Structure 1
Amino acid sequence: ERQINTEYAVSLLEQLKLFYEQQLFTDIVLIVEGTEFPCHKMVLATCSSYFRAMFMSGLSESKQTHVHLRNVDAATLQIIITYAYTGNLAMNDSTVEQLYETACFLQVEDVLQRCREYLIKKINAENCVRLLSFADLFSCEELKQSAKRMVEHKFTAVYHQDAFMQLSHDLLIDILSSDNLNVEKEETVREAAMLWLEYNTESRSQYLSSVLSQIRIDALSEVTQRAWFQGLPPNDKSVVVQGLYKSMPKFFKPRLGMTKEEMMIFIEASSENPCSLYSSVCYSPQAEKVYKLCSPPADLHKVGTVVTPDNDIYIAGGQVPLKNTFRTVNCFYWFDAQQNTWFPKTPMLFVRIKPSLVCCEGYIYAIGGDSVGGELNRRTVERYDTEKDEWTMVSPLPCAWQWSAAVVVHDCIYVMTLNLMYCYFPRSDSWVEMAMRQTSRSFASAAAFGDKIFYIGGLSVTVEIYDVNKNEWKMAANIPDPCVRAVVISNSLCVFMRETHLNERAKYVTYQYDLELDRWSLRQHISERVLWDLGRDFRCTVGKLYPSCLEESPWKP
């Protein structure tokens, strides 16, 4: 059907807006705690699913011109009316709750979906349990699930949120009884359930018993009984009887968060499947297996990795082929530790090629990486805010460097280039000159192990160790065209190198390096029966993953 809108629908909406702001042809007025809102019935019927029944049903409101609508905020109803009259919402970050409250009040489906998306995108660090209780009160399965997983991930690291105390039982039961608790130990959930019953007892003793049972035998074999003898109300006999029941039944099973194996995440591998360009796989140091990961964009490559102290994976920048009949994109992504997917985040402001992301003081710092190339000050850096979810410009780099590396030592930013090093102080937002290397090597990376930076490789086997407390560069030894990948494994400095000769196959083997010995002892030789060739542009980083969520990479020995 022909529904042309060229200069017609916009003109109609502009005429309606003009009639609204001039108070013309209005036949209904909303009374909101003394505030008047003259409007029309047609717009309220086409926008809200409640006003259509308010103006159709032949009751009292039908003839009532002065309808007194209560339990609604003035500003929220005003923004809903102006959204109905112009189509633009222009929502902030503070009044989203009351907006959704009154949007669900009038079943206004479009603004409901808009606010639902805005809330599902903005579960950053703190409003998680709050918006989870919000979605529990206003049954919203979409928001409910994302918030559920978000809490399963972060709540099991703070378990002290002020909002977490005020939760309904069913929601707490769903949270605690789930097998998605990202906890490496079983006593933290026990004490967390405990403190949730240390603020409210006596009248709430039923909930106490329920959560106690939920904790299961794994955490029921603790001080739970003694703490209860201490806080139980007097003259309670059957309560001890029902508490003694919880010890032998109800399927004691292992949890999921304990499977936080410290593994080796790789990217841009040799797609086991021929013409496929690249793939992201993983390696297990202890399990001696090779797991795979899903490509974040599935077509874009040349990305940079970073791992926060909370074991989080991020991906920024990269280039994607234009697919006309490689363009650079500043998109951003984050790896899910359980869903084996990639949820995007706030993109960058500059399209970078192979950005070097560094985490420090809870902030992500992307140093260099072909920001735009044609900058007036070619040396610049853009940092990320993991809490506010925004990018903040900081003091630019002193000199323009290419194929550089950057690490973080002692809560400070350290970027390494051919021969120079600069310490970005995040507190004073300044760059202090550091020691210069006597050797000029590029195309190499550095590792931040302890309080020493180990710049390995370059063009080789150059081992130049730097210390922060000493501020000096020294050599240790030569590792016995190697592709070096220095990294931290089990609080012990190790390396992952691959050698390649003429008419010979590649071999993967990791060595154990000692500080005072200056020697790379043979730790483990990666057999080719489990791991195949990776390539040249592959990257390495240390991080904890889950074996059950991920899938093994099928490949013939």
Structure 2
Amino acid sequence: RQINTEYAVSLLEQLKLFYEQQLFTDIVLIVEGTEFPCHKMVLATCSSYFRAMFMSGLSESKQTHVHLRNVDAATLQIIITYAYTGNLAMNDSTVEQLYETACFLQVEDVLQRCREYLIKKINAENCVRLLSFADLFSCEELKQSAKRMVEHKFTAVYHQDAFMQLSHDLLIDILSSDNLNVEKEETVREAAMLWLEYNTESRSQYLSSVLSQIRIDALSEVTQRAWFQGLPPNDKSVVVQGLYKSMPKFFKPRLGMTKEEMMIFIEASSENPCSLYSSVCYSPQAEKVYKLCSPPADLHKVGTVVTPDNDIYIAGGQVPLKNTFRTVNCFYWFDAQQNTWFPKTPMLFVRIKPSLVCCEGYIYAIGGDSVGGELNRRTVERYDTEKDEWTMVSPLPCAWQWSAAVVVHDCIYVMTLNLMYCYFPRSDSWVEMAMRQTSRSFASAAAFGDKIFYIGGLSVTVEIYDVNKNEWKMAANIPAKRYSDPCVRAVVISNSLCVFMRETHLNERAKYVTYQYDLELDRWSLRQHISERVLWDLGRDFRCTVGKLYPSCLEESPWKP
């Protein structure tokens, strides 16, 4: 039995003290002239290479001085600090060299720690770099994660400097995969070309291999003429092998072309009584209802946000204590292919129904019950999508509840009962814009074009605001029925303003129908009526947002018409 109370801590601390005082040392590591007198026992324990270094009978087993090369001394001191105390304390810059030295020394625990740290830090730019790093040092978890991140982002960037310097096998795996998040088939073609234009006459065979990989759909466009311009002289059989890649090799449709603009819904009426709420989706064009997996599977009252790059995030929320609703500041992100939710850096305050707004690539969480007891309650907190951290910003002018916030013209706009403040995204200047003549709450707003459409409130209030004009005006009243309960939802659909409303009467069933609204007509034309045979009841606390999803990755929601 390992008694952790007395001996373990005391033994570890005394070993660390002996290391500090250079006591009972019998082995010293020479690293480019730097001396590291650590002790044989702890070396052989942590590392799986030092045990063979000191146990296997050779000339270095009986050697007081050992000249170990190809290892960094700063990283080696970090390793020996982790070896005398159990604490790694890794930064964000020296992770690559630390992992390389750990792999060379075969230290499993620090290898796993660095693997987890790297798999948690594939943010935006090191994706291709760490993918190449994992290709050099075999790491299945890192390889798969970096491959997915590359298939997600490089398909939208395809210009990274590090991407040019890649091995043939990794590039073939990337290109031949059917996970390319590209809505068009020419971008991958030009990416492959530019990968084969900066290094030509050196990778001509690999040029032919990538040419075959990109396949006929993009091979029949321009590649022949560009290659004729750039081919080496006196090349004949290369023409023969290039001409062959027209008929064969199974031309098939890709997966990134299925970016159907749909609607993501949360907190729906769960089918099985064992579950409370569920997240589902609706297809405006396919006229189908898809489902999504709950991010925590137990926590509710979350807020949604969609970046211009079509990303889904979940922040805040409350979960039942399950003693024998507590608020959690956790954060999550939705995977567009794996149909799962990977968590991210949690917030600093446990918010209830936060309002997340994206601007300048930053996620801004406005209001939503930060803590309540916090003296400064009229406050906000934003997110960094690149650095993966939360930065405090200028607080709210006035404290508001059940508010809504949108982004227009790269500027933060938050709407409340009657007031509105514009927060300069860069100058952090909360300046009052205009005040509504009607006091309505429990409503949301949509940022369509350059006009904010605040719909609903307690109703059918249609108050249109323009940034360039800075004024509030009414347009019309949405066609509703007598004694109805219009749950209004305003959102952009296919670059056209539309609404999604549900009416409820006494002893009557709910009806779902979306209307097409015109700017100059001030009328909501009947666009499409959602049939109850495909979509069932949603509820009251459901939320709506616009985003593109994959039908194959998701699954249809089974429900009897």
Do both share a fold (TM > 0.5)? yes
Shifted more, 511-520 versus 275-284: the winner is 275-284
Q: Distance in 1 between matches of 2:2 and 2:200?
A: 63
Q: Counterpart of 1:203 in 2: which secondary structure?
A: coil
Q: Counterpart of 1:483 in 2: which secondary structure?
A: coil
Question: Residue 502 of structure 1 is aligned with which of 490, 506, 509?
Answer: 506
Q: Counterpart of 1:272 in 2: which secondary structure?
A: coil
Q: Distance in 2 between matches of 1:150 and 1:82?
A: 33
> Where does residue 84 of structure 1 map in the other structure?
83
Q: Counterpart of 1:130 in 2: which secondary structure?
A: helix
Once the two structures are TM-superposed, the CA of residue 367 in structure 1 deviates from its matched residue by: 0.1
Q: Distance in 1 between matches of 2:83 and 2:274?
A: 51
Once the two structures are TM-superposed, the CA of residue 426 in structure 1 deviates from its matched residue by: 1.2
Q: Distance in 1 between matches of 2:503 and 2:188?
A: 47
Q: Distance in 2 between matches of 1:351 and 1:159?
A: 38
Q: Distance in 2 between matches of 1:126 and 1:275?
A: 42
Q: Deviations over 1:407-465 (max 9, x none)?
A: 00000000000000000001111100110000000000000000000000000000000
Q: Distance in 1 between matches of 2:274 and 2:429?
A: 46
Once the two structures are TM-superposed, the CA of residue 303 in structure 1 deviates from its matched residue by: 0.0
Q: Deviations over 1:53-105 (max 9, x none)?
A: 00001111111111000000001111111101000000000000000000001
TM-score, reference length from structure 2: 0.99
Shifted more, 349-358 versus 200-209: the winner is 200-209
Q: Counterpart of 2:152 in 1: which secondary structure?
A: helix
Q: Deviations over 1:106-154 (max 9, x none)?
A: 0100000000000000000000000000000001111000000000000
Shifted more, 310-319 versus 57-66: the winner is 57-66
Q: Deviations over 1:172-205 (max 9, x none)?
A: 0000000000000000000000000000111211
Q: Counterpart of 1:454 in 2: which secondary structure?
A: strand
Once the two structures are TM-superposed, the CA of residue 356 in structure 1 deviates from its matched residue by: 0.0
Once the two structures are TM-superposed, the CA of residue 375 in structure 1 deviates from its matched residue by: 1.7
Q: Distance in 1 between matches of 2:2 and 2:73?
A: 35
Q: Counterpart of 1:502 in 2: which secondary structure?
A: coil
Q: Distance in 1 between matches of 2:225 and 2:209?
A: 17
Q: Distance in 2 between matches of 1:420 and 1:241?
A: 72
Unpaired runs of at least 5, structure 1: none
Q: Counterpart of 1:197 in 2: which secondary structure?
A: helix
1:366-381 alignment runs, 5 A limit? 366-381=365-380
Q: Deviations over 1:237-261 (max 9, x none)?
A: 0000000000110000000000000
Q: Distance in 2 between matches of 1:539 and 1:248?
A: 49
Q: Distance in 1 between matches of 2:392 and 2:145?
A: 30
Q: Counterpart of 2:215 in 1: which secondary structure?
A: helix
Once the two structures are TM-superposed, the CA of residue 218 in structure 1 deviates from its matched residue by: 1.1
Once the two structures are TM-superposed, the CA of residue 309 in structure 1 deviates from its matched residue by: 0.0
Of all paired residues, the percent bearing the same amino acid is: 100
Q: Distance in 1 between matches of 2:328 and 2:247?
A: 56
Give the aligned CA root-mean-square deviation in angstroms.
0.4
Shifted more, 58-67 versus 289-298: the winner is 58-67
Q: Deviations over 1:201-250 (max 9, x none)?
A: 11211111110110011111111000000000000000000000001100
Q: Deviations over 1:263-289 (max 9, x none)?
A: 010000000112410000000000000
> Where does residue 18 of structure 2 map in the other structure?
19
Q: Deviations over 1:343-389 (max 9, x none)?
A: 00000000000000000000000000000011212100000000000
Q: Counterpart of 2:41 in 1: which secondary structure?
A: helix
Shifted more, 106-115 versus 215-224: the winner is 215-224
Q: Counterpart of 1:351 in 2: which secondary structure?
A: coil
Once the two structures are TM-superposed, the CA of residue 473 in structure 1 deviates from its matched residue by: 0.1
Q: Counterpart of 1:97 in 2: which secondary structure?
A: helix
Q: Counterpart of 2:387 in 1: which secondary structure?
A: coil
> Where does residue 336 of structure 1 map in the other structure?
335
Q: Distance in 2 between matches of 1:129 and 1:439?
A: 53
Q: Distance in 2 between matches of 1:33 and 1:359?
A: 49
Q: Distance in 2 between matches of 1:365 and 1:221?
A: 45
Runs of 4+ in 1 over 4 A off after TM superposition: none
Once the two structures are TM-superposed, the CA of residue 543 in structure 1 deviates from its matched residue by: 0.1
Q: Distance in 1 between matches of 2:347 and 2:380?
A: 11
Q: Counterpart of 1:268 in 2: which secondary structure?
A: strand
Q: Distance in 2 between matches of 1:371 and 1:191?
A: 47
Q: Distance in 2 between matches of 1:246 and 1:464?
A: 59
Q: Distance in 2 between matches of 1:207 and 1:147?
A: 23
> Where does residue 46 of structure 2 map in the other structure?
47
Once the two structures are TM-superposed, the CA of residue 539 in structure 1 deviates from its matched residue by: 0.0
Once the two structures are TM-superposed, the CA of residue 7 in structure 1 deviates from its matched residue by: 2.3
Q: Distance in 2 between matches of 1:520 and 1:170?
A: 55
Q: Distance in 1 between matches of 2:220 and 2:287?
A: 34
Once the two structures are TM-superposed, the CA of residue 392 in structure 1 deviates from its matched residue by: 0.1
Q: Distance in 2 between matches of 1:66 and 1:274?
A: 70
> Where does residue 381 of structure 2 map in the other structure?
382
1:49-198 alignment runs, 5 A limit? 49-198=48-197
Q: Distance in 2 between matches of 1:535 and 1:440?
A: 25
> Where does residue 7 of structure 1 map in the other structure?
6
Q: Distance in 2 between matches of 1:177 and 1:22?
A: 57
Q: Distance in 1 between matches of 2:111 and 2:166?
A: 24
Q: Distance in 2 between matches of 1:26 and 1:121?
A: 38
Q: Distance in 2 between matches of 1:417 and 1:106?
A: 59
Q: Deviations over 1:508-534 (max 9, x none)?
A: 000000000000000000000000000
